[PDB]
């Protein structure tokens, strides 16, 4: 395709902040990638921000420092950013820019793609039709995740959400083994993980843990330490999504993308906007944050005629534990469902501190069902939730009514509360529970009472499951 020699300029009409203005450029185009070479020999990349006649502006990625007026080369590429996607990238580790960092070789690209991606036709959407298992009993049993659902995970500063993310990574998978393990051996599942805006301790911890779990043969990893250039923050997600797309729809696999710390994404985007001199929007965040998060989240689902899917589990932190902060508000609007973690539960030394009372789901009704699972799921979930809500409000009642006036059934509700928080929720970092184990523990916890109190379960399944 491209065959022309590239240009290079020694023109610098000025510099200001993280930008560098030049001119006398022939037929510039927007979003063109630009290299730079300083007097001391360092090489730095960049992108074109502004274009006006023969004037140009380039935001230098690595940060502007020591750029002379007359001694500075500026080569142009003439193409927008393009990713070298390839199936073989699994088992590797990269930085934000895509340069490998695990002592490995440059990726022998199998195909080149546009970093931005393209919108997917709503006509060719396919509704989800089956669940998955994340390895967490609290999440699978109480709140199903379909193929193609977009469930965020709200957390706050000071909670162990990162440990939960690592646990989800090292145990995510499928439950097709309902019928037979022989037909289950056909596994076509992979995970792509995008650590962004992460401090150094957590980056090392992630790398070590992922390497320890022994399933790195199906994990792609992207790291962007908080040291690296702030603009690389808002380029890491695009690379991750392009890779996930190429794997999903060109290899017919089942990919699970997990994004971390979207608050840092928001902050980096804010800084880019403010450097770009644009007028501020609400709360100092730019107006089109909605559109931007939309174009990031909307790349998933299922495609008619392709055997594959993309599931999204973004994570983010709520400043000041404020549920009406814009980032969680917009994230909730665009996405489907929500999962909480609560300070008090972590403060009860319960791991994972997953607060199911305000945790919802949107596709649970259709993710589960006969065949893809047992026939005894939805009623069990309803009963567990109802029992737990009764138990908690009843503890609130006994707090003042006195334990002496309590009925014996009241003690049964308290027993349910304590056992539910002792066994169902608490699992431990490596106790890989399956869905079937989770439902077994659920039935065991339900066995405390007679079927008469269990008024959310149909009698037909009571005659089968309750007397076990």
């Amino acid at each position: 395709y491209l065959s022309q020699p590239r240009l290079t300029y020694k023109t610098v009409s000025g510099v200001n902040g993280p930008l560098v203005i030049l001119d006398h450029v022939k037929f510039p185009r927007y979003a063109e990638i630009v290299h730079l070479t300083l007097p001391d020999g360092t090489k730095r990349s960049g992108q074109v921000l502004e274009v006006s006649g023969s004037k140009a502006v380039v935001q230098v990625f690595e940060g502007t420092s020591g750029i002379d007026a007359k001694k500075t080369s500026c080569e142009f590429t003439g193409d927008i950013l393009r990713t070298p996607v390839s199936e073989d990238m699994l088992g590797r580790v990269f930085n934000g820019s895509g340069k490998p960092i695990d002592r490995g070789p440059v990726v022998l690209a199998e195909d080149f793609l546009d970093i931005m991606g393209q919108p997917i036709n709503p006509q060719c959407r396919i509704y989800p039709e089956e669940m998955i298992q994340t390895g967490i009993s609290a999440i699978d049993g109480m709140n199903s995740i379909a193929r193609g659902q977009k469930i965020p995970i709200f957390s706050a500063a000071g909670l162990p959400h990162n440990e939960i993310a690592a646990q989800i990574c090292r145990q995510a998978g499928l439950v097709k083994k309902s019928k037979d393990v022989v037909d289950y051996s056909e596994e076509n599942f992979a995970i792509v993980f995008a650590a962004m805006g992460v401090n150094m301790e957590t980056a090392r911890f992630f790398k070590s843990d992922f390497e320890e779990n022994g399933s790195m043969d199906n994990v792609c990893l992207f790291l962007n330490l908080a040291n690296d250039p702030t603009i690389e923050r808002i380029i890491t997600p695009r690379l991750a999504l392009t890779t996930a797309e190429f794997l999903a729809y060109q290899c017919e696999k089942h990919v699970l993308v997990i994004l971390t710390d979207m608050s840092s994404y928001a902050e980096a985007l804010r800084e880019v906007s403010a450097a770009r001199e644009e007028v501020p929007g609400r709360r100092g965040f730019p107006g089109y944050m909605y559109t931007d998060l939309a174009t990031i989240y909307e790349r998933a689902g299922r495609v008619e005629g392709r055997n594959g899917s993309i599931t999204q589990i973004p994570i983010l932190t709520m400043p000041n534990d404020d549920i009406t902060h814009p980032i969680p508000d917009l994230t909730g609007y665009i996405t489907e469902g929500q999962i909480y973690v609560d300070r008090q539960l972590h403060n009860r030394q319960i791991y994972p501190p997953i607060n199911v009372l305000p945790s919802l789901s949107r596709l649970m009704k259709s993710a589960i069902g006969e065949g893809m699972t047992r026939k005894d799921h939805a009623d069990v979930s309803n009963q567990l939730y109802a029992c737990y809500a009764i138990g908690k409000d009843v503890q609130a009642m006994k707090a003042v009514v006195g334990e002496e006036a309590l009925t014996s059934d009241d003690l049964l509700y308290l027993e349910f509360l304590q056992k539910f928080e002792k066994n169902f929720i608490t699992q431990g970092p490596y106790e890989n529970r399956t869905v079937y184990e989770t439902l077994d523990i659920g039935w065991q916890l339900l066995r405390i009472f007679p079927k008469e109190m269990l008024k959310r379960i149909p009698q037909s399944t009571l005659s089968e499951f309750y007397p076990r």
Binding site: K26, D102, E211, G214
Partner: protein, 169 residues
């Protein structure tokens, strides 16, 4: 339980580390292989330089391409010292066609003081009047550009099609 957990988890860490290292060695060998291929291609082109009859045509094309690229009132061209007679004929041929192709007149010159490093395989570099804008067009740069643009096809030819690629787009 504590002891058996510890020893089994440890055995798993070493096994996983060994597998990682082995795959990395495979990929490293692949990279050394492709780099060797690139070096051999460089050697081949360096050898093919010496046939002057087609080298004149190639130099003509390179010069014309660069003239089209820059498009400035004043221009300067720089080459190897031993290549002067050929480039002079090349520009002699190049000026009129460009003039009629752009409906303009330009002033073109060649230096006789600065020359390219001899270690360069061959080619030309171009500059504007103020020597502030240049377009380097040597065989090395063009080789690099083409190889980088083509690396997917090179993989496809040198290692077979991907096993699990079910579509093209």
């Amino acid at each position: 339980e504590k002891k058996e957990k510890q020893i089994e988890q440890q055995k798993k860490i070493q096994m996983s580390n060994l597998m990682n290292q082995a795959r990395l060695k495979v990929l490293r060998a692949r990279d050394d292989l492709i780099t060797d291929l690139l070096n051999e291609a460089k050697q081949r082109l360096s050898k093919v330089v010496k046939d002057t009859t087609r080298y004149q045509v190639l130099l003509d094309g390179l010069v014309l391409q660069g003239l089209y690229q820059l498009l400035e009132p004043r221009m300067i061209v720089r080459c190897r010292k031993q290549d002067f007679p050929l480039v002079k004929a090349a520009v002699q041929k190049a000026i009129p066609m460009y003039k009629i192709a752009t409906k303009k007149d330009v002033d073109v010159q060649i230096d006789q003081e600065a020359y390219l490093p001899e270690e360069i395989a061959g080619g030309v570099e171009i500059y504007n009047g103020d020597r502030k804008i240049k377009v380097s067009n040597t065989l090395e740069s063009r080789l690099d550009l083409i190889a980088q643009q083509m690396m997917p096809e090179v993989r496809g030819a040198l290692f077979g099609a991907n096993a699990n690629r079910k579509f093209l787009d």
